[PDB]
Amino acid sequence: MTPPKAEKRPYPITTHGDTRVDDYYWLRDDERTDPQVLDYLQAENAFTDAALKPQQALRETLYEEMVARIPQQEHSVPYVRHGYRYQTRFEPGNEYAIYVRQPQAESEHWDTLIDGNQRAEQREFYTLGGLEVSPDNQKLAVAEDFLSRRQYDIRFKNLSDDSWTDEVLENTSGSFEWANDSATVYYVRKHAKTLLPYQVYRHVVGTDPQLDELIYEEQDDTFYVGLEKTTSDRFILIHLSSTTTSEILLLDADRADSTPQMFVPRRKDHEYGIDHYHQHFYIRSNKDGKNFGLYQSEQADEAQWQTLIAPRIEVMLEGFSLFRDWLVVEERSEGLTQLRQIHWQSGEVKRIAFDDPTYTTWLAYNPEPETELLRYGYSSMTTPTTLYELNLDSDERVMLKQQEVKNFTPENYRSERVWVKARDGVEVPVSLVYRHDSFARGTNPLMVYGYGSYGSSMDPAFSASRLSLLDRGFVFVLAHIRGGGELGQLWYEDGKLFKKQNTFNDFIDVTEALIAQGYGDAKRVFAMGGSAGGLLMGAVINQAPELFNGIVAQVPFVDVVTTMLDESIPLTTGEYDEWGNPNQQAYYDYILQYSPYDQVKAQDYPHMLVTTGLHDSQVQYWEPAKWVAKLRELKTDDRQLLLYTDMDSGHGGKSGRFKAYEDIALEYAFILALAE
Numbered sequence: 001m002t003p004p005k006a007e008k009r010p011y012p013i014t015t016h017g018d019t020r021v022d023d024y025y026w027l028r029d030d031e032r033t034d035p036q037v038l039d040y041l042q043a044e045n046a047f048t049d050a051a052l053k054p055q056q057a058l059r060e061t062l063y064e065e066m067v068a069r070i071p072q073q074e075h076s077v078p079y080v081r082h083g084y085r086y087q088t089r090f091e092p093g094n095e096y097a098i099y100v101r102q103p104q105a106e107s108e109h110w111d112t113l114i115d116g117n118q119r120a121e122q123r124e125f126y127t128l129g130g131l132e133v134s135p136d137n138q139k140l141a142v143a144e145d146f147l148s149r150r151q152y153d154i155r156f157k158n159l160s161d162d163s164w165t166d167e168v169l170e171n172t173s174g175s176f177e178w179a180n181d182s183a184t185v186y187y188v189r190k191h192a193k194t195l196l197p198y199q200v201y202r203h204v205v206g207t208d209p210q211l212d213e214l215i216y217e218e219q220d221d222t223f224y225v226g227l228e229k230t231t232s233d234r235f236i237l238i239h240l241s242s243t244t245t246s247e248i249l250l251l252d253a254d255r256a257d258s259t260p261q262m263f264v265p266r267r268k269d270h271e272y273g274i275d276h277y278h279q280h281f282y283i284r285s286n287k288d289g290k291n292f293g294l295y296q297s298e299q300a301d302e303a304q305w306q307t308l309i310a311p312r313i314e315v316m317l318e319g320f321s322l323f324r325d326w327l328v329v330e331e332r333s334e335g336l337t338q339l340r341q342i343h344w345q346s347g348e349v350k351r352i353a354f355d356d357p358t359y360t361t362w363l364a365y366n367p368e369p370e371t372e373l374l375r376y377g378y379s380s381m382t383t384p385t386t387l388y389e390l391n392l393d394s395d396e397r398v399m400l401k402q403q404e405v406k407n408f409t410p411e412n413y414r415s416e417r418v419w420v421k422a423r424d425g426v427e428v429p430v431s432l433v434y435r436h437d438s439f440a441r442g443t444n445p446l447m448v449y450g451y452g453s454y455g456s457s458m459d460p461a462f463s464a465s466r467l468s469l470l471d472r473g474f475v476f477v478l479a480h481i482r483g484g485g486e487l488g489q490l491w492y493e494d495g496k497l498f499k500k501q502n503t504f505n506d507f508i509d510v511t512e513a514l515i516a517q518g519y520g521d522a523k524r525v526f527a528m529g530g531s532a533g534g535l536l537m538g539a540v541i542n543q544a545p546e547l548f549n550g551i552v553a554q555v556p557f558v559d560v561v562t563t564m565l566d567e568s569i570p571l572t573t574g575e576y577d578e579w580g581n582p583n584q585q586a587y588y589d590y591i592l593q594y595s596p597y598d599q600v601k602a603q604d605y606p607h608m609l610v611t612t613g614l615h616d617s618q619v620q621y622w623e624p625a626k627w628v629a630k631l632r633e634l635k636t637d638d639r640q641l642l643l644y645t646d647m648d649s650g651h652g653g654k655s656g657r658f659k660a661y662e663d664i665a666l667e668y669a670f671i672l673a674l675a676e
């Protein structure tokens with residue numbers, strides 16, 4: 001009964017002589033210090049509560065259904081690192097993992113490093129960003145988010161007696177490494193207002209952080225500061241990264257007074273990363289090709305890099321792991337992840353087959369290089385997430401664990417890789433899955449999912465929650481659209497900057513091909529995207545509103561032009577080589593044509609559920625809030641338009657193994673009611 005009507009306070013923004021009027025600009029508050037804002041967000045939540053009350057039963061049915069799939073007890077396969085065996089445990093009803101370990105010689109008794117349920121201690125949000133035991137096995141460092149804004153606290157535990165030290169490192173990125181003395185930690189501090197990771201500090205454990213020494217400050221705010229430690233343990237790396245360009249600095253992990261030593265000075269459009277092992281640096285670099293190569297060197301000097309793997313236009317080299325006798329690399333070709341092993345001596349090459357049309361494989365955690373046992377991951381649209389161990393020499397493979405899914409028989413579902421020819425003749429890969437026994441050409445609701453930014457890939461993986469749609473006749477689709485990484489670096493570059501419109505075109509083209517070929521019911525087409533996938537949702541409903549019956553747009557990036565004009569707002573300065581720099585006229589004009597907030601107009605929009613989190617640090621809460629306000633004022637349809645603001649979460653929604661399914665049940669009930 002009557003949606004809330006945002007206050008209008010005309011706010012002009014002038015760039016290149018173009019004045020845009022933002023009536024809803026006031027919805028932005030930089031602390032949360034304006035009662036007017038909360039009142040709007042609270043009123044939208046009350047309208048959403050009232051409007052979705054009918055589905056109360058169906059939500060609790062789906063919640064209960066999704067929870068019923070999950071083993072209540074869930075134990076990881078143990079591993080051994082520096083004389084200790086480690087395991088991660090959920091016990092019945094637990095929202096968060098318990099991390100335990102024991103001496104390698106021991107079997108009966110395990111010690112608790114940390115209990116997430118104890119640490120979460122009543123709070124609506126908790127994330128362990130990282131935990132790591134000192135090289136001397138005496139101390140534990142943990143990075144925890146208590147709020148959901150990804151401002152990680154770092155704290156330290158004495159493992160001998162399970163006491164905590166007095167100090168906390170605040171507003172960190174959660175990225176840290178131990179010096180080899182186990183007394184010092186290096187860690188990354190975030191800018192107080194932009195939240196950009198920009199400073200490395202040295203901290204002596206057990207001391208006041210006011211005494212922490214600044215080691216490196218990144219002067220160019222288009223870059224991110226991270227920390228890594230090499231396989232050799234000789235170096236802690238300052239990894240400075242941006243869209244286009246890398247630089248690594250070495251810190252001697254064996255010394256207390258290390259200062260950053262330059263590896264290779266930054267060069268525009270040269271991305272590199274390194275490890276150190278067997279006395280050599282191993283470099284993944286795009287110096288000679290966009291799809292990257294792998295290089296070995298005794299020295300930093302780029303002229304000395306020996307080619308191990310030459311860049312191939314057909315193969316994206318993505319990642320690598322170093323063993324005693326084998327190099328193992330993660331590669332992508334024909335839209336599919338593979339792993340390849342190369343013997344350092346014989347140069348013999350072996351590849352890991354998978355015949356599934358619709359899977360992902362990856363290097364899992366391998367704590368020790370001195371072994372012939374590779375642990376690697378596998379998941380598909382039809383096979384739950386699996387941990388394999390491969391003997392690299394004998395080829396024998398053992399399945400260590402497959403995720404148990406209750407109330408599920410894989411033989412009931414089938415998946416396909418389909419190729420869709422886009423409006424410009426370019427072939428776009430699609431992964432889809434459905435329940436065979438309920439499938440009939442032309443009759444099944446479609447759920448089409450896209451992201452398509454940053455060269456991130458929507459790799460086909462198993463979802464247990466997704467069975468709630470598959471078991472009600474849905475065909476679930478991953479559209480591997482340009483801007484994503486699915487076909488290598490050129491696929492990414494062909495969907496950003498002056499090519500970003502290809503992301504949106506590709507998603508429409510895939511959706512129309514699928515309806516034309518009878519995979520979906522033309523009246524029951526749903527789409528979902530989050531964050532950069534929310535940009536996708538926003539652009540496609542402006543451009544092709546009548547295509548979709550209903551839309552879920554999570555933490556959506558929609559105020560593109562205003563956001564990219566403002567260096568004060570988190571992530572802006574790091575994304576000029578993604579969308580463009582709208583201080584430049586060409587970029588301003590190109591981006592304005594798709595910026596969803598700016599292109600809302602008087603037309604019929606599909607049914608829409610917009611979700612955000614008040615603390616969201618990547619897409620600030622006001623973008624979706626403004627976008628809903630402006631949609632409510634101008635839309636000509638009277639279809640559902642709901643805003644759900646979670647007051648106690650951020651970019652990744654509700655924390656907790658079971659709690660997360662509250663958001664998915666709400667989303668899926670909204671879609672299922674429209675598919676009745």
Ligand SMILES: *CC(=O)[C@H](CCCCN)NS(=O)(=O)c1ccc(C)cc1
Binds near residue numbers: 531532533571572
């Ligand atoms: C969650 C998401 O897609 C957001 C959108 C942020 C838009 C900022 N104006 N991106 S992110 O911050 O999570 C992010 C994810 C991957 C990469 C490579 C960069 C940023």
